[PDB]
Design a protein around this ligand. Sequence first.
Ligand SMILES: N[C@@H](CCC(=O)N[C@@H](CS)C(=O)NCC(=O)O)C(=O)O
Ligand SMILES: N[C@@H](CCC(=O)N[C@@H](CS)C(=O)NCC(=O)O)C(=O)O
Ligand SMILES: [Mg+2]
Lengths: 198, 198
Amino acid sequence: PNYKLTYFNMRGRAEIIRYIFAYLDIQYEDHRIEQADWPEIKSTLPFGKIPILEVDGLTLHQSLAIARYLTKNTDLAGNTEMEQCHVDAIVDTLDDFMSCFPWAEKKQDVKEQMFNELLTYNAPHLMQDLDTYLGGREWLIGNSVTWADFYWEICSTTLLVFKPDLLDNHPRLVTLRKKVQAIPAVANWIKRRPQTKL
Amino acid sequence: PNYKLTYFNMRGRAEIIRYIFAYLDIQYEDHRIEQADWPEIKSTLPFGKIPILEVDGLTLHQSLAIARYLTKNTDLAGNTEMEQCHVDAIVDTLDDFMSCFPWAEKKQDVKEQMFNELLTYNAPHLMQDLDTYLGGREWLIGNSVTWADFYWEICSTTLLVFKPDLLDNHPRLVTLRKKVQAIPAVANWIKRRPQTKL
Ligand SMILES: N[C@@H](CCC(=O)N[C@@H](CS)C(=O)NCC(=O)O)C(=O)O
Ligand SMILES: N[C@@H](CCC(=O)N[C@@H](CS)C(=O)NCC(=O)O)C(=O)O
Ligand SMILES: [Mg+2]
């Protein structure tokens, strides 16, 4: 089909979709809107939220729903129904934590305090749980890369902006990031994508 | 398969799994724990959260990952890949909203204020978006019931505890709740499940 992804000019919640299209070598329109565009665009959306992916004229929404759709019947999905469950579960665990952050908080002092508390008091527990889950394995699930590995690299990239030492006790989680970033199609996307804070 | 579900004695995030088991007529251990014996159990769980489902000795986590695993290759999944994406997306839209509520927030003042703000301002927008999405159709996705309709019924049941007038302007959403509740296997489970507030 023809694909049109609509999101802000940010990695954010679209980036997982962008990595999947890159890895699979699938062409798509990467439509990046400005804030000034938002009201007009929002009025068309099913639940007033982006990203959305238009597929031959039909709208999909929810970043992870779309990610899962794009990876079905590909080597990124997980090799068994059980492993597909593990992929989903790891992704939702990461997403649950990312959703704790007050990204829309206007009071900058309150926002900063909350970010620093989450990254200092809460994040280390998740990092240890992830490290223990990965153990000595090459990838989070199965014997080959899945979109859970991609989501780890995406989420950790943003977390590292606010907490540079996040992974100083977890070299195995850094190695995993590096392994994702070394995949040629992914490396190419990372190199060429617009440089945005988030 | 041999299934053991572990959660609190609460509908909460386990209820969607319980509906799927009931609808599919699958036998399982409904293991309900208390906060007293939690830290014993918590330390053994992969990411320190419940629900978990043990399948033939193997542990799965994340309620929606589990729900999806159980509905794969059943009539509850959605009839095309695109429709399966729609199911997933509705479920995450509902979950995103339910997860905004600070359920475990001990600072009484912010909890009361947040609940009130989500229910007064956000909830009516979501109800309008859902009603518009449903339109005149019988089920949320496709021509038959999916686990997205189950999740609607479950989420709305909890929202109605806090906002009884939630669906005053949305008869079609109430009709959908009743259609789910009238499915014999679901009806039976609703009748026999422990009566909890949440
Ligand atoms: N869980 C959803 C969350 C979508 C979401 O909340 N998107 C934000 C932007 S990142 C949005 O559209 N907010 C509404 C607004 O900006 O008015 C997903 O991953 O797609
Ligand atoms: N998105 C996860 C949420 C898991 C979660 O946060 N569960 C809560 C209970 S509803 C929990 O285990 N909290 C940790 C604790 O009580 O220490 C899921 O749906 O499984
Ligand atoms: Mg989620």
